[PDB]
């Protein structure tokens, strides 16, 4: 699955100091970034423009530039009238998922101080189930701006699918790319008296889905404690899998790695004898 996620982080220290920074993700890949101090989108991939013409691309950029200024002025005016105290953090999560099997679904979620407050549902703004009373005052005002509503709908229901389809075409190779992990063992801090912490590291794999387990022959060890899948600077992943055991019982244990990049050849690392 390759959903497009457009993300916006807007911080307001006070009514005179603000900062808006955005980014776009196609699946697990970051395709775009847009800093507060730039008038233009920074394309992070050679295929970031998709199938859009230079003209269509300048139109989308114009829309964001207008939106960014307008969002800022609007939040400041809502804060003033609704007696909302600074600092304010607003977050936006918008995009779509192109499904050749069915239609396409889109979303536009807004958060205030790390909590959901409203979303764009069909052709209008809807507040979150448990949202403060001032949110319904802001929704009324937002829904009065019919032209913005028609634009958000045009972007989510027409432009986003056209953008995603093109990125998926121009990006075919980079999205289907395979990077092989390299595995290594280590001994972690003792988790008891005569106990051993058996650590298995797996780094440099792409794509993100992986399977790492401590084994004893073909018997999967249920004591395997996986860590979080952590990122690397070169767009690959890291994963640490542990096993708390008796010191004697470590001999015969193996770390086994399954990854799509492996050519039918799982990584098997034996605990040293």
């Amino acid at each position: 699955l390759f959903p497009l996620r457009c993300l916006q982080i807007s911080s307001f220290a006070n009514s005179s100091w603000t900062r808006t920074d955005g980014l776009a993700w196609l699946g697990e890949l970051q395709t775009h970034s847009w800093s507060n101090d730039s008038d233009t989108v920074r394309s992070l991939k050679p295929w970031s423009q998709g199938t859009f013409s230079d003209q269509q691309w300048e139109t989308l950029q114009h829309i964001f530039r207008v939106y960014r200024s307008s969002f800022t002025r609007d939040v400041k005016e809502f804060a003033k009238m609704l007696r909302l105290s600074y600092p304010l953090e607003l977050q936006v999560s918008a995009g779509c998922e192109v499904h050749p099997g069915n239609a396409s679904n889109n979303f536009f979620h807004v958060a205030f101080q790390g909590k959901d407050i409203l979303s764009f549902q069909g052709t209008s703004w809807e507040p979150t189930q448990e949202a403060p009373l001032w949110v319904n005052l802001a929704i009324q005002v937002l829904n009065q701006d019919k032209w913005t509503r028609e634009t958000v709908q045009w972007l989510l229901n027409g432009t986003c699918p056209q953008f995603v389809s093109g990125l998926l075409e121009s990006g075919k190779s980079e999205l289907k790319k395979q990077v092989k992990p390299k595995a290594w063992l280590s001994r972690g801090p003792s988790p008891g008296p005569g106990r051993l912490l058996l650590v298995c590291h797996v780094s440099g794999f792409y794509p993100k889905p992986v399977w790492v387990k401590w084994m004893r022959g073909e018997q999967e060890q249920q004591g395997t404690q996986p860590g979080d899948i952590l990122p690397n600077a070169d767009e690959t992943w890291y994963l640490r899998a542990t096993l708390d055991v008796v010191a004697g019982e470590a001999a015969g244990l193996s770390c086994r790695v399954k990854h799509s990049s492996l050519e039918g050849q799982d990584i098997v690392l034996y605990w040293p004898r």
Partner: T-cell receptor
Amino acid sequence: GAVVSQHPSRVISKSGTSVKIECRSLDFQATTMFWYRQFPKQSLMLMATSNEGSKATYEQGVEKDKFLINHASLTLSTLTVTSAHPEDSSFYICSAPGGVGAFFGQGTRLTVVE
Amino acid sequence: QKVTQAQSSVSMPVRKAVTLNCLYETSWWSYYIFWYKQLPSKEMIFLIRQGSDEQNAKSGRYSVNFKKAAKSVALTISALQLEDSAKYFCALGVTGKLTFGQGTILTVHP
């Protein structure tokens, strides 16, 4: 009623003088204004885009120094027809995005006499 | 982005109906089509809008026969009155940036 006002509605100018046309948004803030030109018995051709903060965008085939655009504020865009000649005698109409698409001004009937 | 109005002039008697044709070209998957009339004062009067993902638009005496596949957006003016004599412009636009066709002069006869 109209929410965008152009001033003046009519202007007679001598060749070689620069003509200033104003486009005002009435009781709304506009961050963009589109400027169109219509020659007699012709269609409306988009000339340029007036932007707040950034410079004007000119359309393909438009002479950039002939027309000086300036987004003075969030309610005012000016078009200056620098050193006008009878060939520049036309009808200039601005619009502001909004409503169901864009709000048009009433236009400026510009006649340049030698 | 191009809008073509092939008819330069159309004449029709009062109380009848007329059809003004419009063909367009656009690289956008979703867009809006507009119809305008220009007064002898040169003032632009919005008539009707048609969304690419909408049902055939209808606003009083104005109707659109939107044919998405053929990329045609004709305007029918029903029960024609002398006040309908004007130059009618078809336009394609996204986010207020409208591009106009050549225009069609309609002359309603008594």
